Design a protein around this nucleic acid. Structure first.
Ligand SMILES: [Mg+2]
Ligand SMILES: [Mg+2]
Ligand SMILES: [Mg+2]
Ligand SMILES: [Mg+2]
Ligand SMILES: [Mg+2]
Ligand SMILES: [Mg+2]
Ligand SMILES: [Mg+2]
Ligand SMILES: [Mg+2]
Ligand SMILES: [Mg+2]
Ligand SMILES: [Mg+2]
Ligand SMILES: [Mg+2]
Ligand SMILES: [Mg+2]
Ligand SMILES: [Mg+2]
Ligand SMILES: [Mg+2]
Ligand SMILES: [Mg+2]
Length: 190
RNA sequence: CAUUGCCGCGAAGCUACCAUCCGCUGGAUUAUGGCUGAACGCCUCUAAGUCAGAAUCCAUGCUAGAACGCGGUGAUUUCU
């Protein structure tokens, strides 16, 4: 159809500074800073009143309009991550062999290492990405908490830890053993 | 001499899964599973973006070296 003008609102809270040179977005709030290259979308950012940023598509088809709300969600995730952060909580699900998840140093490269997953002799290793903080819960058993500003990094590192512990050659409606995301929320939220 | 007369052993050379030795590790992916995430206020692996991933592919490595692809370097002729 080629809609003439489609436009999304982006609400900036008070402690957040957003600098958008051409389509490279830098979001600087209290937790730190984040940058996203958006030069694959062809949208137009503008600033209204230092708390509101419009993003708009002009003469855009159905898919080009679809990518605009995606752009709004990406910049909102940047703002939410540098204001509140993200916190993904995973649980260890096992039947007989207790999954042993430790965090270890190998040449300064900060690995999560998983032992005894279904009684395996194979040590699994998931590198902690930059920004992601790993800690282990107290008073909640079998809980590993991945935290950070970047929801991309926290979610992908939690997904790496889930995919590294998938069951081979067994009925997986019965062999449920694994590490699973149980909670997605924020670092500092109430 | 017997068209290497025949028989035993026989160095050398050649040779045998009939003897030994040796046969590399990185990147990008397919299927598939995912992440973030709209379209479609929800959802969704997908549309933009993105992670992992096969005896695959491309490298590394191994063979040849364009006789019309190239480089560097040594010497370049008289009592002729
Ligand atoms: Mg599997
Ligand atoms: Mg079976
Ligand atoms: Mg005679
Ligand atoms: Mg005769
Ligand atoms: Mg004789
Ligand atoms: Mg005889
Ligand atoms: Mg031979
Ligand atoms: Mg090699
Ligand atoms: Mg895929
Ligand atoms: Mg996709
Ligand atoms: Mg895509
Ligand atoms: Mg994205
Ligand atoms: Mg990959
Ligand atoms: Mg030649
Ligand atoms: Mg020369």
């Amino acid at each position: 159809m080629k809609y003439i003008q489609t436009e999304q609102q982006i609400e900036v809270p008070e402690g957040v500074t957003v600098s958008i040179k051409s389509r490279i977005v830098k979001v600087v709030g209290p937790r730190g800073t984040l940058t996203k290259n958006l030069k694959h979308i062809d949208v137009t950012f503008t600033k209204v009143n230092n708390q509101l940023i419009k993003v708009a598509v002009h003469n855009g088809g159905r898919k080009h309009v679809a990518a605009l709300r995606t752009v709004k969600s990406l910049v909102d995730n940047m703002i939410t991550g540098v204001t509140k952060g993200y916190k993904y909580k995973m649980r260890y699900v096992y039947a007989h062999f207790p999954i042993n998840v430790n965090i270890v140093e190998k040449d300064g490269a900060k690995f999560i290492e998983v032992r005894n997953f279904l009684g395996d002799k194979k040590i699994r290793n998931v590198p902690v990405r930059d920004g992601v903080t790993i800690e282990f819960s107290t008073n909640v058993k079998d809980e590993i908490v991945l935290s950070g500003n970047s929801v991309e990094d926290v979610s992908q590192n939690a997904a790496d830890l889930q995919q590294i512990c998938r069951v081979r050659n067994k009925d997986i409606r019965k062999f449920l053993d694994g590490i699973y995301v149980s909670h997605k929320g924020f670092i500092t939220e109430d």
